[PDB]
Amino acid sequence: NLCPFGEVFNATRFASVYAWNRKRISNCVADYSVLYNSASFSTFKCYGVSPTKLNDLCFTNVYADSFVIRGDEVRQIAPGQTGKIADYNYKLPDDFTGCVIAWNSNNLDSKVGGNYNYLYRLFRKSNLKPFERDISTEIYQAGSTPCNGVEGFNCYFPLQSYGFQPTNGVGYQPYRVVVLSFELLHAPATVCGPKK
Amino acid sequence: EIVLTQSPGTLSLSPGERATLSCRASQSVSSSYLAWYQQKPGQAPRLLIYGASSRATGIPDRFSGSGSGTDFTLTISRLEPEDSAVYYCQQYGSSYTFGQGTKLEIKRTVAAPSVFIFPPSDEQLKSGTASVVCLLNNFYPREAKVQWKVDNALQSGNSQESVTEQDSKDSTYSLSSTLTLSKADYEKHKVYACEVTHQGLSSPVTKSFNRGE
Amino acid sequence: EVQLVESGGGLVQPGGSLRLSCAASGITVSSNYMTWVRQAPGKGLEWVSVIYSGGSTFYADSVRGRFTISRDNSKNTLYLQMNSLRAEDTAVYYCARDLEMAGAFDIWGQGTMVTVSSASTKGPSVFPLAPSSKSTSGGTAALGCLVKDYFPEPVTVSWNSGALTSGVHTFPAVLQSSGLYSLSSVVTVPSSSLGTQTYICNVNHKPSNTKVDKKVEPK
Ligand SMILES: *[C@@H]1O[C@H](CO)[C@@H](O)[C@H](O)[C@H]1NC(C)=O
């Protein structure tokens, strides 16, 4: 009956930010104290909630979104931000009620020669809506000529590899992000901290 | 911010030689975000290499980029006269910053200048000033001495020079020196002379005219 | 054929405003990262701003709060709105298409000159540099035009309506003590062609709307 936060945080490999994973958390008691009382997280920003109280509230549903981005891009995982990640990969809403948790994962997600697993979307015509997920690999038409599914000039693959190398500057190293959003609806609450 | 320092500031190499240009970043950048541009005189920059090692379209294999971390290199083998330009490195991962540039000059055989002296026009004299122009054409190397003499008096504080950029085809330079006097001071003297010193000349060459002749 | 054609450069007093345009063909502006890059006279390149296909915009520290990048899909045109201009904004401004990791700044415009100065526009006077009577240098003779006393830069000088390009040297303008610019354009021709060929220099100073054709004759 304890929420499977370890399945999310301690997962062996994370998803690419363009294809971010979402785990629905329900029918469990949370025990957020394992998270906020850890020295491993370089980022623990909460919005609309106080992290200390978290073991004394209930929410009707909890979502845990996880992905990997650059260290310099963690600042974009926040309400009202812009940039490649917030515009084309993962968009938080302005009234986001939840917490953003990030930590350096250079030891796990970087390979000598470059880790070409983790991708981000570079080309898109419009910004994503909040919590929108776009996994299309359609060739991006940058000019007036149609692409017909063939890469070329003015016709680019929309995804790019980070190529995480262990010797990158810290801002260029991979960071694992977990975004908890807390739902409050007119329905029974099925996620609660231990105290309540 | 990320600051890119290019070394050296100037290069002077013979055709067929190889040019090694360096770009050093104040902090490490991913090689995926480095670029090299070439800028010829009076023209927009032209992309040579993106992503450290990738050649832009139409760029011959003669250009090759390399590097990692804080250090990136642009190499131009088999240099040709039209490689004379200014070369910029750029990073586009953390914002967008460029380096100050490395000016590549292409050497050639020593070429003496051809010297022409131009008296002021009658139309300009009517206005009240007299511009005397000396032309040093098609020479190499760049160092030239232009000495104005008026009735054999050496003139100082009196003239301004302009040097063309290196020609993309014959690797030469051209220089103009302009002596500016009032109509009154111009009519005060007779012989106006331009004396040119250059490595391609064994002795200084003087072009002169007598006023009103 | 892919082309970025810029316009809007000119002279502004300090604190004044200007608006640049970058008309694109072969490139959908609204689908691209579009950037402005400027180059002060004699110096290197400096990034100014960028606009994403999705509409996000970013600016350099030295221009934020005073510049605004924008676009118009119907005209396929990039814009740079410049306000509160200072002398250090004097530069040639370039628009460029930006491919980032897929190719950087691959397409550039031709550039427009922007001059921030309290000095007023002044058209140039064009004087001939006559070929000499004693033209014994090879078979070659030198002639040209002296373009004097103008502000601001630039002036364009062609010869015989652009039909004469060989042997032509247009020198970089020099600023005089008066605060006005001045340059010369010379051309080297065979001495025998004097008498068989007419040499006219065409001087255009767009900031003052002065076009001047000047015939250069011996003596
Ligand atoms: C994840 O693994 C770490 C490392 O041993 C452990 O300290 C932590 O309790 C685990 N967290 C969860 C939520 O299972």
Residue A28 φ/ψ region, left for φ over 0, alpha for ψ in the -120 to 50 degree band, beta for the rest: beta
Q: What CA–CA distance (Å, rounded) separates B15 from C2?
A: 32
Label residue A75 exposed, middle or buried (CB < 10 Å: 0-12, 13-18, 19+): middle
Distance, in Å, from the CA atom of B17 to the CA atom of C169, rounded to the nearest integer, reads 28
| Nearest CB neighbour to B69, from listed A153, A163, A167 | A167
Q: Which of A3, A9, A40, A54 to mutate to test the pocket of ligand 1 (most atoms within 8 A of CB)?
A: A9
Q: Is C143 exposed, middle or buried (0-12, 13-18, 19+ CB in 10 A)?
A: buried
Which sign, positive or negative, has the C-alpha torsion A23, A29, A33, A34? negative
- B180: nearest Cα among B114, B115, B125: B125
Contact B207, B168 (CB under 8 A): no
Q: Which helix (H) or strand (E) holds C143?
A: strand C140-150
Specify the number of domains making up chain A.
1
Q: What is the 3-state secondary structure (H, E, C) of chain C?
A: CCEEEEECCCEECCCCCEEEEEEEECCCHHHCEEEEEEECCCCCEEEEEEECCCCCEEECCCCCCCEEEEEEHHHCEEEEEECCCCHHHCEEEEEEEECHHHCCEEEECCCEEEEECCCCCECCEEEEECCCCCCCCCCEEEEEEEEEEEECCCCEEEEHHHCCCCCEEECCCEECCCCCEEEEEEEEEEHHHECCECEEEEEEEHHHCEEEEEEECCC
Check C94 against B45: CB less than 8 A apart.
Answer: yes
Question: C205 and C155 in contact (C-beta within 8 Å)?
Answer: yes
Three-class DSSP category at C71:
strand
Structural domain contains residue A167: yes
Q: Is B83:B19 a contact under the CB 8 Å cutoff?
A: yes
Q: State the pairing for strand pair C210-216/C168-170.
A: unpaired
CA distance C94 to C106: 12
Find where tokens 């299309």 sit.
A136
User: Given the DSSP bridges, would you call strands C125-129 and C140-150 parallel, antiparallel or unpaired?
Assistant: antiparallel
Is the CB of A10 inside a 6 Å radius of any atom of ligand 1? yes
CA distances from C66 to B81, C19, C21, C41, C87 (A): 42, 12, 17, 21, 14
Other beta carbons within 10 Å of B126 = 9
- Round to whole Å and give the CA distance between A144 and B77: 37
- B3 CA → ligand 1 middle, Å: 40
Name the 3-class secondary structure at A191.
strand
CA nearest A142: which of C100, C219, B136? C100
**A100 contacts A69 by C-beta, under 8 angstroms:** no
Residue C148 near residue C182, CB atoms below 8 Å: yes
Question: In whole angstroms, what is the distance from residue C168 CA to residue C159 CA?
Answer: 8
Interface test with C, best of B118, B139, B173 (most C CBs within 10 A): B118
The residues facing B196 across adjacent strands are: B146, B205
A:48-107 residues touching chain B, CB 8 A cutoff: 72
CA distances from B106 to A169, B113, C25, C147, C166 (A): 37, 18, 36, 30, 21
Q: What is the resolution of this structure in A?
A: 2.7
A88: DSSP letter: H
**C-alpha distances out from residue C98 to A58, A162, A180, C104, Å:** 47, 18, 35, 5
Instruction: Give residues with Cβ within 8 angstroms of C74, minimum separation 6.
Output: none
> For residue A63, is it within any domain?
yes
Q: Which residues of C touch A83 (CB under 8 A)?
A: 56
Q: Could you tell me the two tokens for C182?
A: 């001045």
SS3 label, residue A34: helix
Six-digit token string for C51: 């606009």
d(CA B211, CA C122): 30
Pick the residue whose CA is nearest to atom 9 on ligand 1.
A34
- Residue C197 is classified by DSSP as B
Rounded CA separation C168/C166 (Å): 6
C52 CB burial (10 A radius; 0-12, 13-18, 19+)? buried
Asked if B89 and B175 count as a contact pair (C-beta separation under 8 A), the reply is no
Strand pairing class (A58-59; B145-150): unpaired
What does the block give as tokens for B38?
Answer: 């070439």
Do the first three CATH levels of B4-106 and B114-210 match, i.e. the same topology?
yes
Residue A32 beta carbon below 6 angstroms from any ligand 1 atom: no
DSSP letter (8 states) at residue A149: T
Q: State the DSSP code for C151.
A: B
Residue C62 structure tokens: 């030295």
Phi, psi (deg, nearest 5) at residue B113: -80, 150
Q: How far are the Cα atoms of A41, B29, B169, C86 from residue B81, in angstroms, in the given order?
A: 56, 33, 6, 39
Is A79 inside any structural domain?
Answer: yes
CB contact at 8 A, B73 and B99 = no
β-bridge pairing A191-192 and A28-29: parallel
- Alpha carbon distance A97, A54 (integer Å): 12
User: Which pairing describes strands B34-39 and C45-51: parallel, antiparallel, or unpaired?
Assistant: unpaired
Count of other CB atoms within 10 angstroms of residue B129: 19
Task: Please give the domain boundaries of chain C with CATH numbers for all domains.
Answer: 3-116 (2.60.40.10), 125-216 (2.60.40.10)
Let me know if A157 is exposed, middle or buried by CB neighbors in 10 A (0-12, 13-18, 19+): middle
C54–chain A Cβ distance below 8 A for any pair: yes
Q: Which of the 8 DSSP states describes residue B186? A: H
Q: Which amino acid is at B192?
A: Y
Helix%, strand%, coil% for chain B, nearest 5:
10, 55, 40
Residue C96's nearest CA partner among B96, B4, B62 is: B96
How many Cα atoms are found within 13 Å in the side-chain-facing hemisphere of A193?
Answer: 13
Q: Return the CATH number at A97.
A: 3.30.70.1840
Neighbours of A159 (CB within 10 A): 18
Kindly state the DSSP code that residue A94 receives in the 8-state scheme: T
**How far is C-alpha C28 from the chain's CA centre?**
25
Count of Cβ atoms closer than 10 Å to residue C151 Cβ = 21
- Contacts of C21 by beta carbon, 8 Å cutoff, 6+ apart: C6, C7, C8, C77, C78, C79
Q: Is B148:B177 a contact under the CB 8 Å cutoff? A: yes
Which run of H or E residues covers position A35? helix A33-36
The secondary structure of residue B142, as a DSSP letter, is S
Which architecture does CATH list for B114-210? Sandwich (2.60)
Contact C37, C48 (CB under 8 A): yes
- Residue A144 domain-assigned (yes or no): no
Query: In terms of Cα–Cα distance, which of A123, A109, A112, A114 is closest to A160?
Result: A123
Retrieve residue B51's tokens: 């992503």
Q: How many Cβ atoms sit within 10 Å of the Cβ of residue C18? A: 20
The experimental technique used to determine this model is: X-ray
Residue nearest (by alpha carbon) to ligand 1 atom 10: A6
Total CB pairs under 8 A between chain A and B: 18
Q: Strand A191-192 vs strand B4-7: parallel, antiparallel, or unpaired?
A: unpaired
Rounded Cα gap, residues C14 and C82, in angstroms = 12
- Residue A107 Cβ < 6 Å to ligand 1: no
Number of residues in chain A: 196
Question: Amino acid letter at A35?
Answer: L
**How far from chain centre, in Å, is Cα C57?**
27
Judged by a CB distance cut-off of 8 A, whether residue C1 touches chain A is no
User: Which residue, chain included where needed, has tokens 């050296």?
Assistant: B8
Q: Give the β-pairing of B114-118 and A61-70.
A: unpaired
- Kind of pairing between the strands at C18-25 and C77-82: antiparallel
Task: Give the angle C86-B96-A138 at the CA atoms, nearest 5°.
Answer: 130
The rounded distance, in Å, linking the Cα atoms of B181 and B188 is 10
Using alpha carbons, select from C31, C196, C37 the residue that is nearest to residue C114: C37
Give, rounded to a whole angstrom, the gap between the first and last alpha carbons of chain B. 64
Whole-angstrom Cα distance, residue C149 to residue C210?
13
Q: How far apart are CA A16 and CA C9, in angstroms?
A: 44
B19-29/B63-76 β-pairing: antiparallel
Which residues form the domain of A41? 5-128+160-192
Which residues of chain C have a CB within 8 Å of the CB of A123?
53, 102
Question: Are the CB atoms for B169 and B82 separated by under 8 Å?
Answer: yes
Return the CA Rg of chain A.
18
Tokens of C42: 């004699």
- Asked whether residue A136 is domain-assigned, the answer is no
* Residue B184: DSSP 8-state: H
Q: Could you tell me how many helices (H) and strands (E) chain A has, helices first?
A: 4, 12
Using CA atoms, how far residue B204 sits from A115, B115, B145, B162, B199, in Å, is 66, 11, 9, 20, 10
Radius of gyration (Cα) for chain C, nearest Å? 21
C27 contact A CB<8A = yes
Residue C28, amino acid: T
Beta bridge partners of A178: A66, A101
Chain B contact for A153, CB < 8 A? yes
Question: Which spans in B29-182 are helix H?
Answer: 122-127
In a domain, A34, yes or no: yes
Whether domain B4-106 has CATH 2.60.40.10: the reply is yes
- Tokens in use for C166? 């060989």
Domain boundaries, chain B: 4-106, 114-210
Asked if A43 and A101 touch (Cβ cutoff 8 Å), the reply is: yes
Residue A134 is assigned to a structural domain of this protein: no
User: A5 C-alpha vs ligand 1 centroid, how far in Å?
Assistant: 9
CA distance linking residue C107 with residue C13, whole number of Å: 31
The answer to whether B162 and C174 are in contact (CB under 8 A) is yes
Smallest CA-to-CA distance from A91 within A71, A67, A60 is with: A67
